[PDB]
Design a protein around this nucleic acid. Structure first.
Ligand SMILES: CC[C@H]1OC(=O)[C@H](C)[C@@H](O[C@H]2C[C@@](C)(OC)[C@@H](O)[C@H](C)O2)[C@H](C)[C@@H](O[C@@H]2O[C@H](C)C[C@H](N(C)C)[C@H]2O)[C@](C)(OC)C[C@@H](C)C(=O)[C@H](C)[C@@H](O)[C@]1(C)O
Lengths: 37, 121, 112, 213, 116, 53
RNA sequence: CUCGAUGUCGGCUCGUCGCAUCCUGGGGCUGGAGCAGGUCCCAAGGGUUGGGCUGUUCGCCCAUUAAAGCGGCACGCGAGCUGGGUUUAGAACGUCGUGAGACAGUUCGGUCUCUAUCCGCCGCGCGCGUCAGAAACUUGAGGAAACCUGUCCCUAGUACGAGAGGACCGGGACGGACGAACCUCUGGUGCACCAGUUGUCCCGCCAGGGGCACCGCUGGAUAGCCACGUUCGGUCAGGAUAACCGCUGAAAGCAUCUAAGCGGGAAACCUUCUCCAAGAUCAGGUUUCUCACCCACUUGGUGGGAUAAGGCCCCCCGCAGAACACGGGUUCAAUAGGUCAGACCUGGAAGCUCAGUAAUGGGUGUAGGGAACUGGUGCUAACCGGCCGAAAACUU
RNA sequence: AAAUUCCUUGUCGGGUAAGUUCCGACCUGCACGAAUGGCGUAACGACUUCUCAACUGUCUCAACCAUAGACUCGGCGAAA
RNA sequence: CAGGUGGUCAGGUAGAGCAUACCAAGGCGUACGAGAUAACUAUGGUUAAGGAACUCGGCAAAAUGCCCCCGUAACUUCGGG
């Protein structure tokens, strides 16, 4: 995961889901898999 | 037998003195036994021969005045300290060595000094 | 020590010669150097016998190659099966800790 | 169950082992003198056993103690120590009036031996805590062997608790673990223990089987 | 005598030797000798050993008693009367008794006596 | 260092009171005369005689 | 704030805390083939060396190393130390000033005070409490300590790779540093040991000693203490977890580790272990022992007194100790001492004898001396003792 | 590159394992220089600075011993 | 009051010495004591292995120590060293 506290989608497959406190994204391809804070 | 300890190089490469620079084997290790690699500068050799002075070279200890206990129950005290310089490959930089060697070298396994010793133990 | 005396009483060695410091003796020790057995006949002089019973040890001093060796064996130790005494001698000291000549002239304790 | 027994230590020796090595060994007379008085995990929630060991005259012990020896049915013993057993009582492993011996430790079975140390006196912070105490020559006025400092200035305007300071060391019950018994003399009592048992020679020592195998 | 732990009597060990030999000289003189209790505790074994030599009674015992008590004559009396007087007692030649503590230092005083 | 402050007479007195003196006496000891109460320490030289008073 | 004084730098000693983690632990991504490597997440339990140049932190370097953190606490720490540096007085240079003098210019020299009252902390006690008085064992709330890590061998030259190279995961060996305990071994020491020995004096003289000269000095040296010594420890294992991973699964006919649910998950947290511990006033428990016990009152309660069981004080002690405590012992005794036989230490007594011109050497003779260690033995000291100690007011 | 240089650990060599110190040479000498002496100078120096062997508890790493204290007991009995 | 105070005489034995060690004449035990293996402090002692690694710096201690006999560098102002 790349953790930067200002999270956006990268490609046209990232889903800005929310998951138990941290607001992560998932494009189902762990190229970034980034997550907020 | 530690850093800053002159001990006579007993092999045929000219050096008669080495100040142990280090005691190779562990972080903050202090005392090198009968048969553990030390670093060593060369305090005193023959001019022109195999080795010069001031060389940061490994060595192996074969004589320590302090009694080494063997796990049988006996000891081995020698008269004067002694270190045969070595290479990083299981070979002494020298070809023969002068005087007995502590048998506590079949284990650390440079079993070429225990080969080329005049008398092991 | 009676019951600790018994702790070591079935742990003794027998018939081993009488020897005090001064006697040159000849310790045939068991060492397994290389093969499935080996015997090294450490010859030298007894420069010490720090006693105690089983805890008793001698210190044979050999002079090997222009360099001595002070080899401190225990009596009763099972890596010893022949403490041959070569030469006896009635010396003045009991600990012979002065044997630091190596010029040989005085390295030899006179006969008896 | 954790097979333990009492006993006193008679001193150290060395014994030569099978492989022609040395065994700097401690002799502990755990001899066949340890009797019991069970401690139910129901009356008092232990599941422990009360091992006795010693030889004293009736005249030597006071009435409460001899009453407990009589109610257990045994002739008094200078010591009377206790050993935890388990989450279980099991009602058949022991008995009140039982007899023990050093024989349970079966020559190789590692023991862990516990007992009070030798008092190292009122020992200062270098016999007590290993302080590389201040220098000895380069001007050090009077502070060789002396502590040094105790904390900082104004926020901890106080010495923290548990500061390493001088005080009476020694005598504290210590447990030296994993002492492989070299021999067992059930024919005159003792139990050899390859190691260094804590305590004065001739003092109480509880030889418990290990926990670490 | 095993040694003493702690500070030796008088000053150092040499003064303790001298103290002991003096106390034993006057003990084998008068029999009944008052000291402070620690002096008598140090002297009881020492004196009893000397009297062991006394009841031995041979030039080697005389020469090993004269290596403590310089005096030839108190030792004459040792190996004359005090010696044979203990023809029976194997050990137990002296006897400590408690006197009242010396005023001025409250030093616990004790009188050590040859048993008779 | 010096006393930073003087002592409240409570503390002062409270450990002037821990300045006690010991005791022992062994009453009814027949010696020459009327029974003297010498201490249990000394009663052997009380009996034998090697005690003043 | 402090000027009727808050002692300044560096080092040492001792710490301690933080996480902004150098290593060790778990991970995600990688332009990550394998080795690795680079970056981000969690993680503070341990650990984080030795030297050369410098007053130096700052650094640079040598040899390592698993790694050789970055900070806080009066740039922690001078009633704890050093005083090398700063900013006293002397002196010299260079420079400034006519000059006295001056320079965050330099270079030599240059007093570091206190017996600890209160808090703190480290140890030890006394008094009471704990609803009768003890005694033995203990429960364990709550604490503290402790927590490191490398190499090598098989796996396997396997996988991964054109090949040099080269695994993960698992099983075993050898260590380093740290700590604890013990004294069997090595080794240190040894002021009541043994012998040798130089000066001098003495014991009437010789012989044999002894006093003093660092214990005269030198060779040893048991006990004790100890490390350079030995042995042991670090863990395995459970629970909940972080990061991360995951299943079931909607809202929001899907997709999602999340909303309900469940699972994995680390040296970090509680456990596990070692140690303290019921003053744990919530003052515990199992058991054993003693229980009329006489006076006076205001019958009683209430005081007193007497003791029980018990403990103390005295005394003989201790490898237990500053005092105190603790442990052992007290005549039915082996507790100290002595005495005997030992283990050991020393090293070959004295006398007598014989050889020798004599110095000195052989015999009697493992002698003789002797301290602690062991076991005997009722000879000496533990002494025909003093003290302090119970009786519950009662309820569903 | 000095008792003299700030930059400054100037640069190069000797010495070291590693040398901000030392030695020799160089020479933009911030700011050397001739009786406020210039460069030397054998002997001398409790002067300052460095290197080397003997040696050692200084140190790695401390341990044990004796006395003077501390501690206990009796006596007198302070101080800031 | 552990300081300071002029000069005189000054023995023995070992020693070069009036130093030093032990002693004569002569003095004195000179003024809080008894203990007691605490830490720690001072004064001394000794130490395995190593030998400056300590440090600001070999500070401190250590070693060298004396008699005789050989031998003795650079440099020198020709004395030396
Ligand atoms: C016979 C004993 C002496 O001990 C010493 O020499 C001390 C070591 C001094 O430190 C000397 C010596 C020194 C070298 O070491 C400390 C030095 O550094 C220092 C300057 O003065 C003092 C302790 C100074 O205090 C300090 O003085 C500074 C001015 C302030 C300090 N603090 C900030 C408030 C203060 O503690 C002090 C003022 O004398 C001046 C004390 C004053 C009463 C005296 O002068 C006394 C006569 C002193 O001679 C004395 C104490 O009796």
């Amino acid at each position: 995961v790349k953790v930067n506290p200002s999270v956006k989608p990268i490609c046209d497959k990232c889903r800005l889901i929310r998951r138990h406190g941290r607001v992560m994204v998932i494009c189902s391809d762990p190229r970034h898999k980034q997550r907020q804070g | 037998i530690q850093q800053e300890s002159r001990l006579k190089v007993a092999d045929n490469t000219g050096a008669k003195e080495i100040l142990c620079i280090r005691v190779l084997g562990g972080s903050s290790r202090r005392y090198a036994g009968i048969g553990d690699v030390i670093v060593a500068t060369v305090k005193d050799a023959i001019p022109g021969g195999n080795v010069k002075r001031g060389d940061v070279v490994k060595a192996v200890v074969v004589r320590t005045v302090k009694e080494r206990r063997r796990p049988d129950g006996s000891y081995i005290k020698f008269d004067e300290n002694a270190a045969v310089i070595i290479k990083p490959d299981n070979d002494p930089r020298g070809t023969r060595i002068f005087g007995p060697v502590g048998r506590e070298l079949r284990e650390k396994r440079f079993m070429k000094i225990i080969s080329l010793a005049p008398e092991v133990l | 020590m009676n019951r600790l005396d018994f702790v070591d009483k079935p742990s003794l060695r027998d018939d081993i010669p009488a020897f005090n410091p001064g006697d040159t003796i000849n310790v045939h020790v068991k060492v397994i150097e290389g093969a499935k057995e080996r015997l090294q006949v450490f010859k030298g002089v007894v420069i010490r016998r720090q006693g105690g019973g089983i805890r008793e040890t001698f210190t044979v001093r050999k002079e090997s190659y222009g360099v001595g060796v002070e080899r401190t064996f225990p009596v009763h130790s099972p890596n010893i099966d022949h403490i041959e005494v070569v030469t006896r001698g009635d010396v003045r000291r009991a600990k012979l800790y002065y044997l630091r000549e190596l010029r040989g002239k005085k390295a030899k304790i006179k006969e008896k | 169950a954790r097979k333990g027994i009492l006993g006193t230590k008679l001193g150290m020796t060395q014994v030569f082992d099978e492989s022609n090595r040395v065994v700097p060994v401690t002799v502990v007379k755990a001899g066949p003198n340890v009797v019991t008085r069970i401690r139910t995990p129901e009356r008092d929630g232990y599941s422990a056993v009360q091992l006795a060991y010693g030889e004293i005259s009736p005249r030597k012990v006071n009435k409460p103690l001899t009453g407990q020896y009589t109610a257990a049915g045994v002739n008094p013993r200078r010591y009377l120590a206790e050993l935890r057993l388990d989450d279980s009582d099991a009602a058949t492993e022991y008995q009140v009036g039982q007899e023990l011996t050093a024989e349970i430790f079966a020559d190789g079975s590692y023991v862990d031996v516990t007992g009070t140390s030798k008092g190292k006196g009122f020992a200062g912070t270098m016999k007590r805590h290993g302080f590389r105490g201040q220098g000895a020559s380069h001007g050090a006025q009077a502070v060789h062997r002396r502590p040094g400092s105790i904390g900082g200035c104004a926020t901890p305007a106080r010495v923290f608790k548990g500061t390493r300071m001088a005080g009476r060391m020694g005598n504290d019950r210590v447990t030296v673990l994993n002492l492989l018994v070299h021999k067992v003399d059930a024919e005159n009592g003792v139990l050899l223990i390859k190691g260094a048992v804590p305590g004065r020679t001739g003092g109480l020592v509880m030889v418990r089987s290990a926990i670490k195998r | 005598p095993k040694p003493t732990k702690g500070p030796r009597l008088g000053g150092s060990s040499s003064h303790q030797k001298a103290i002991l030999a003096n106390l034993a000289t006057s003990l084998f003189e008068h029999g009944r000798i008052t000291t402070t209790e620690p002096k008598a505790r140090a002297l009881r074994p020492y004196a009893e050993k000397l009297i062991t030599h006394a009841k031995k009674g041979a030039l080697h015992n005389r020469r090993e008693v004269l290596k403590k008590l310089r005096d030839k004559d108190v030792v004459h009396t040792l190996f004359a009367e005090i010696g044979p007087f203990f023809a029976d007692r194997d050990g137990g030649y002296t006897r400590i008794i408690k006197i009242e503590a010396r005023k001025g230092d409250n030093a616990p005083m004790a009188v050590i006596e040859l048993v008779r | 260092a010096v006393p930073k402050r003087r002592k409240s007479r409570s503390n002062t007195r409270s450990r002037r009171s821990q300045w006690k003196a010991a005791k022992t006496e062994l009453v009814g000891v027949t010696v020459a005369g009327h029974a003297h109460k010498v201490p249990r320490r000394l009663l052997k030289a009380a009996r034998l005689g090697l005690i003043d008073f």
